[PDB]
């Protein structure tokens, strides 16, 4: 393990707004902030770069009794067996349905699987969230 | 003063790739690169969400066994018995775990709980997705 | 009449397997094995288990092409919002789906929704497992 | 597909039981709740003998306050990364936590996982439920 140490320059009023939000937020000090702040900055070029593995969500919300969603979000799903680990679901209300996916691989593999899922008509609110494997961070 | 100067300590691996990444985009120093990814948080962490209920969920990526992490999120969780649905865990490797907290209440309370989760000590990274369960 | 006789239809793979088994063990003919498995099944759906709070999981497998087994299952865990906490999925391959379903209420109710989901056209294997949150 | 219809002459007494119970429970008819015990032993045999492979849950209850329960099932479940697929986790109370594994690989080896797991001092309750991959079954 090795630390470096260096210093920057914020503008002032940014700086000032920033240390007002994390405080609020809950974070315990400014460093600790920028760290996680360099650490997403990677994680997104992980996904634009290379073909390294990564890992991710896709929250989804429908109503299970519109059209044949249900059926069209499971063949999706069994078509991508490889990158989807499991999900989670949630029943909201008689109707409506709230499903996280998890998915593991490459990153223009995920985003196509998410692309696909959302698009569905049956959908009606969605999200793919973009994170990491963890094994190249800290 | 327009500039406020000061230093921060990071990793070395972290600090690498960092550099690595923004010599590539052209980013002349550090301080550019940083006052970025803080502008862009600030805008991010500003925008409303409202009173109105929703259901999210939150996703968040770290090493089980850095500081007291797996106790910090345990403890948090359970305060919040009422918001809190279900988790689902994934173990990525010997270390790391994905996990995805699914959440249902006012919006602003669900952000606020987001926030004391994504900030805990241990989060490598994470994010929150809330949404409301009504038509598109 | 000490014996009622009537006949049963059965997947030529299923029974093939079947027949394989019970010769090994030694079994004469197949109503031995039968009757065996009937009063098994007896026996266990007669337990008691009271009407306490109870905390559990309700594990099932099957194809989700088959019949109308997705509709169904979703239809039937909508109508109790109450008990049911949240379902895990795993795509086990084309056509196979596990699911876990986790629940808390009443046992006698808890019973109850467990058996009608076990019980539904499509559904090739499941159990159920009821605990009390309590001391050991 | 082929179907193979055969008869069977069942103690009149426990056949009464049975048609008496299945309907209680919900099952449509006879017929397909005695599959539904053919299909139950033939899963159970697979857990066995052989090597193919199978798919079980392992539902545990714990106080994560309770000594060092929360890190003893981390450790032991990190080191089995190829058989447990994902996990899903429910807070109970302010002190108890409800959790169920899903697992899919060998038999012997599941076995092993729920013995650690369930041996563990700070599980209070728990069960390892085995099932099949459904491959090789209808
Ligand atoms: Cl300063
Ligand atoms: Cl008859
Ligand atoms: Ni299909
Ligand atoms: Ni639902
Ligand atoms: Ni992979
Ligand atoms: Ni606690
Ligand atoms: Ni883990
Ligand atoms: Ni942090
Ligand atoms: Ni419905
Ligand atoms: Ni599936
Ligand atoms: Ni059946
Ligand atoms: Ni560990
Ligand atoms: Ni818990
Ligand atoms: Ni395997």
Redo the contacts with the bound molecule.
Sequence with gaps: MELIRFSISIPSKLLEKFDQIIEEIGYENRSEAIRDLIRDFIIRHEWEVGNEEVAGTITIVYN?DEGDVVKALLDLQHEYLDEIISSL?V?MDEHN?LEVIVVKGEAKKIKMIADKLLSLKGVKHGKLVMTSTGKELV
């Design positions: 299970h679901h029943h349905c």
